[PDB]
Amino acid sequence: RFWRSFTYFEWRPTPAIHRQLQKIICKYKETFMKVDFDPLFISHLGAPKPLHVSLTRSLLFETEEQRHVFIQEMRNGLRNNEITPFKLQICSYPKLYISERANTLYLGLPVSECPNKAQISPFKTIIAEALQKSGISNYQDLIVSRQNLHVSIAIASNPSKATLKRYQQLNETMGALLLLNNDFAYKLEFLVNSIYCDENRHSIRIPFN
């Protein structure tokens, strides 16, 4: 019906990292079980698939012109804030995140707040400003909070209304157990050279500098 977008960083994990993400997923599910998860970085034919960090929810633009202004203002905001490439640090301990339409659960890795703070802080006002300029003035609910930034690495197969209802309480229970049970000793990070704004047709890559 409309002209949608959403904004993200992309990660193309190497086979070395695939192996680590697979271990994380297996050990989480071991700890959980005493629901199944499919990896998001492997396709159904067994090929690599990119991961991402979502910086916004879905952005509904009623006109193609408004979405265009958004994308221009993203680029302008990046140029004026002098954004250059940086590495983004990713936590090795996962938790559950609810999908945007709330019927799916993902196993995700937090984008850790403290070591990325200086790198990530500018994007909030850059996005907020591009959103307001393009007609979305109620932007607060659309920009992902720093504490919710994450990379989904698996999708829960076949959840349950009850399990979906109580995912946050499951997170409390599992978070405690993961610290007692599991020892995820991986140094996860990736280079961010650009930011993407999706469109149905194709994803617009906006280079930094």
GROMACS .gro file of C-alpha atoms in nm:
model
  209
    1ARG     CA    1   0.000   0.000   0.000
    2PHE     CA    2   0.269   0.244   0.095
    3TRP     CA    3   0.633   0.324   0.037
    4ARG     CA    4   0.824   0.169   0.320
    5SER     CA    5   1.181   0.176   0.436
    6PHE     CA    6   1.395   0.078   0.724
    7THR     CA    7   1.749   0.149   0.822
    8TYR     CA    8   2.027  -0.096   0.904
    9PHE     CA    9   2.396  -0.188   0.921
   10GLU     CA   10   2.493  -0.508   0.737
   11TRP     CA   11   2.733  -0.783   0.851
   12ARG     CA   12   2.869  -1.063   0.622
   13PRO     CA   13   3.013  -1.313   0.871
   14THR     CA   14   3.300  -1.534   0.760
   15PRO     CA   15   3.297  -1.915   0.786
   16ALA     CA   16   3.512  -1.871   1.100
   17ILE     CA   17   3.235  -1.665   1.262
   18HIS     CA   18   2.957  -1.897   1.132
   19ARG     CA   19   3.116  -2.175   1.339
   20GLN     CA   20   3.109  -1.957   1.650
   21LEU     CA   21   2.750  -1.842   1.595
   22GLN     CA   22   2.643  -2.206   1.547
   23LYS     CA   23   2.807  -2.296   1.882
   24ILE     CA   24   2.626  -2.007   2.051
   25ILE     CA   25   2.297  -2.124   1.917
   26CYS     CA   26   2.353  -2.490   2.010
   27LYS     CA   27   2.462  -2.407   2.368
   28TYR     CA   28   2.172  -2.164   2.421
   29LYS     CA   29   1.931  -2.432   2.319
   30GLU     CA   30   2.101  -2.694   2.540
   31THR     CA   31   2.067  -2.459   2.835
   32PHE     CA   32   1.710  -2.374   2.741
   33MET     CA   33   1.592  -2.733   2.680
   34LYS     CA   34   1.709  -2.848   3.023
   35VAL     CA   35   1.115  -2.445   2.057
   36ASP     CA   36   1.398  -2.499   1.805
   37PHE     CA   37   1.619  -2.233   1.631
   38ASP     CA   38   1.719  -2.203   1.268
   39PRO     CA   39   2.037  -2.002   1.185
   40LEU     CA   40   1.976  -1.674   0.995
   41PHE     CA   41   2.331  -1.666   0.845
   42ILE     CA   42   2.285  -1.999   0.654
   43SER     CA   43   2.024  -2.041   0.375
   44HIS     CA   44   1.808  -2.344   0.314
   45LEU     CA   45   2.061  -2.453   0.049
   46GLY     CA   46   2.344  -2.404   0.296
   47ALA     CA   47   2.487  -2.076   0.161
   48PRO     CA   48   2.601  -1.769   0.360
   49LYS     CA   49   2.339  -1.503   0.418
   50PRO     CA   50   2.407  -1.157   0.559
   51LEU     CA   51   2.303  -1.046   0.903
   52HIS     CA   52   2.205  -0.697   1.007
   53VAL     CA   53   2.155  -0.452   1.291
   54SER     CA   54   1.818  -0.274   1.260
   55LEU     CA   55   1.831   0.093   1.359
   56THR     CA   56   1.465   0.154   1.296
   57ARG     CA   57   1.137  -0.029   1.282
   58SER     CA   58   0.954  -0.027   0.949
   59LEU     CA   59   0.896   0.329   0.828
   60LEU     CA   60   0.564   0.392   0.656
   61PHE     CA   61   0.585   0.678   0.405
   62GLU     CA   62   0.256   0.762   0.242
   63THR     CA   63   0.430   0.893  -0.070
   64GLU     CA   64   0.738   0.808  -0.264
   65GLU     CA   65   0.847   1.177  -0.231
   66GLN     CA   66   0.854   1.164   0.148
   67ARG     CA   67   1.063   0.847   0.151
   68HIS     CA   68   1.302   1.017  -0.091
   69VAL     CA   69   1.343   1.316   0.148
   70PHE     CA   70   1.418   1.071   0.430
   71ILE     CA   71   1.696   0.909   0.234
   72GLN     CA   72   1.845   1.244   0.127
   73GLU     CA   73   1.837   1.370   0.480
   74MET     CA   74   2.010   1.053   0.601
   75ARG     CA   75   2.294   1.120   0.363
   76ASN     CA   76   2.306   1.492   0.460
   77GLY     CA   77   2.311   1.404   0.828
   78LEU     CA   78   2.596   1.160   0.782
   79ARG     CA   79   2.802   1.415   0.588
   80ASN     CA   80   2.749   1.695   0.840
   81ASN     CA   81   2.829   1.476   1.138
   82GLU     CA   82   3.144   1.361   0.961
   83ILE     CA   83   3.070   0.989   1.009
   84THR     CA   84   3.359   0.764   0.906
   85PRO     CA   85   3.389   0.380   0.920
   86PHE     CA   86   3.408   0.214   1.257
   87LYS     CA   87   3.406  -0.136   1.404
   88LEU     CA   88   3.099  -0.240   1.589
   89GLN     CA   89   3.141  -0.469   1.895
   90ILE     CA   90   2.886  -0.751   1.937
   91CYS     CA   91   2.812  -0.941   2.263
   92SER     CA   92   2.861  -1.320   2.256
   93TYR     CA   93   2.577  -1.393   2.495
   94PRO     CA   94   2.235  -1.402   2.326
   95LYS     CA   95   1.885  -1.331   2.428
   96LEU     CA   96   1.541  -1.336   2.275
   97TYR     CA   97   1.394  -1.049   2.078
   98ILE     CA   98   1.034  -1.019   1.961
   99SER     CA   99   0.973  -0.954   1.591
  100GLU     CA  100   0.829  -0.625   1.476
  101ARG     CA  101   0.483  -0.779   1.420
  102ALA     CA  102   0.512  -0.976   1.743
  103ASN     CA  103   0.446  -1.331   1.620
  104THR     CA  104   0.806  -1.449   1.592
  105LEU     CA  105   1.104  -1.467   1.829
  106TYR     CA  106   1.466  -1.426   1.730
  107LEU     CA  107   1.779  -1.532   1.912
  108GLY     CA  108   1.997  -1.221   1.900
  109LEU     CA  109   2.335  -1.079   2.002
  110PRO     CA  110   2.323  -0.736   2.173
  111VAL     CA  111   2.519  -0.455   2.017
  112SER     CA  112   2.700  -0.379   2.340
  113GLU     CA  113   2.617  -0.031   2.472
  114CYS     CA  114   2.940   0.071   2.646
  115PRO     CA  115   3.211  -0.003   2.389
  116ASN     CA  116   2.997   0.121   2.094
  117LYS     CA  117   2.852   0.428   2.264
  118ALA     CA  118   3.078   0.681   2.096
  119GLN     CA  119   3.029   0.517   1.756
  120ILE     CA  120   2.653   0.469   1.775
  121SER     CA  121   2.533   0.785   1.958
  122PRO     CA  122   2.523   1.010   1.651
  123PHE     CA  123   2.287   0.793   1.454
  124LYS     CA  124   1.994   0.859   1.685
  125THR     CA  125   1.975   1.234   1.604
  126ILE     CA  126   2.069   1.178   1.236
  127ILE     CA  127   1.776   0.938   1.195
  128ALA     CA  128   1.539   1.139   1.411
  129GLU     CA  129   1.610   1.447   1.203
  130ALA     CA  130   1.568   1.270   0.870
  131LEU     CA  131   1.243   1.121   1.000
  132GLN     CA  132   1.099   1.451   1.114
  133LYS     CA  133   1.199   1.620   0.787
  134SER     CA  134   1.020   1.357   0.584
  135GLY     CA  135   0.692   1.378   0.771
  136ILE     CA  136   0.735   1.129   1.051
  137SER     CA  137   0.733   1.361   1.350
  138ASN     CA  138   0.653   1.089   1.605
  139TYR     CA  139   0.990   0.920   1.564
  140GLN     CA  140   1.058   0.806   1.921
  141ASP     CA  141   0.887   0.468   1.883
  142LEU     CA  142   1.047   0.409   1.542
  143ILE     CA  143   1.418   0.444   1.637
  144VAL     CA  144   1.558   0.134   1.805
  145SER     CA  145   1.681   0.216   2.159
  146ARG     CA  146   2.055   0.157   2.222
  147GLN     CA  147   1.966  -0.109   2.476
  148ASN     CA  148   1.765  -0.302   2.210
  149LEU     CA  149   2.015  -0.284   1.927
  150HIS     CA  150   2.106  -0.641   1.826
  151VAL     CA  151   2.201  -0.877   1.550
  152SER     CA  152   1.946  -1.164   1.507
  153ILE     CA  153   2.134  -1.489   1.445
  154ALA     CA  154   1.857  -1.738   1.465
  155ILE     CA  155   1.481  -1.755   1.435
  156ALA     CA  156   1.275  -1.962   1.674
  157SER     CA  157   1.093  -2.238   1.487
  158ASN     CA  158   0.728  -2.252   1.597
  159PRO     CA  159   0.699  -2.043   1.915
  160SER     CA  160   0.368  -2.053   2.122
  161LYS     CA  161   0.135  -1.777   2.235
  162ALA     CA  162   0.250  -1.844   2.591
  163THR     CA  163   0.618  -1.840   2.508
  164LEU     CA  164   0.570  -1.520   2.303
  165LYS     CA  165   0.364  -1.377   2.587
  166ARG     CA  166   0.644  -1.434   2.837
  167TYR     CA  167   0.964  -1.384   2.638
  168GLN     CA  168   1.095  -1.108   2.865
  169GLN     CA  169   1.058  -1.331   3.171
  170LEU     CA  170   1.222  -1.611   2.979
  171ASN     CA  171   1.511  -1.369   2.913
  172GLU     CA  172   1.552  -1.307   3.289
  173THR     CA  173   1.560  -1.684   3.357
  174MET     CA  174   1.790  -1.771   3.066
  175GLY     CA  175   2.021  -1.471   3.115
  176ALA     CA  176   2.100  -1.594   3.469
  177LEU     CA  177   2.144  -1.951   3.358
  178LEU     CA  178   2.361  -1.853   3.062
  179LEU     CA  179   2.606  -1.681   3.298
  180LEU     CA  180   2.612  -1.989   3.528
  181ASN     CA  181   2.608  -2.253   3.255
  182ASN     CA  182   2.785  -2.134   2.945
  183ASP     CA  183   3.113  -1.977   2.860
  184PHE     CA  184   3.097  -1.792   2.527
  185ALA     CA  185   3.442  -1.667   2.471
  186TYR     CA  186   3.421  -1.507   2.130
  187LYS     CA  187   3.537  -1.159   2.021
  188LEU     CA  188   3.263  -1.058   1.778
  189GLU     CA  189   3.285  -0.742   1.572
  190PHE     CA  190   3.245  -0.609   1.221
  191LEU     CA  191   3.338  -0.307   1.015
  192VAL     CA  192   3.059  -0.055   0.938
  193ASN     CA  193   3.143   0.132   0.607
  194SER     CA  194   2.790   0.247   0.533
  195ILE     CA  195   2.425   0.251   0.638
  196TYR     CA  196   2.136   0.100   0.436
  197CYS     CA  197   1.783   0.220   0.376
  198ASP     CA  198   1.570  -0.057   0.235
  199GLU     CA  199   1.311  -0.030  -0.035
  200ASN     CA  200   1.106  -0.310  -0.193
  201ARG     CA  201   1.295  -0.273  -0.522
  202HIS     CA  202   1.640  -0.258  -0.363
  203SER     CA  203   1.834  -0.139  -0.063
  204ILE     CA  204   1.999   0.196  -0.091
  205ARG     CA  205   2.354   0.191   0.042
  206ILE     CA  206   2.465   0.531   0.181
  207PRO     CA  207   2.841   0.553   0.211
  208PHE     CA  208   3.008   0.722   0.503
  209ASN     CA  209   3.230   1.037   0.503
   0.00000   0.00000   0.00000
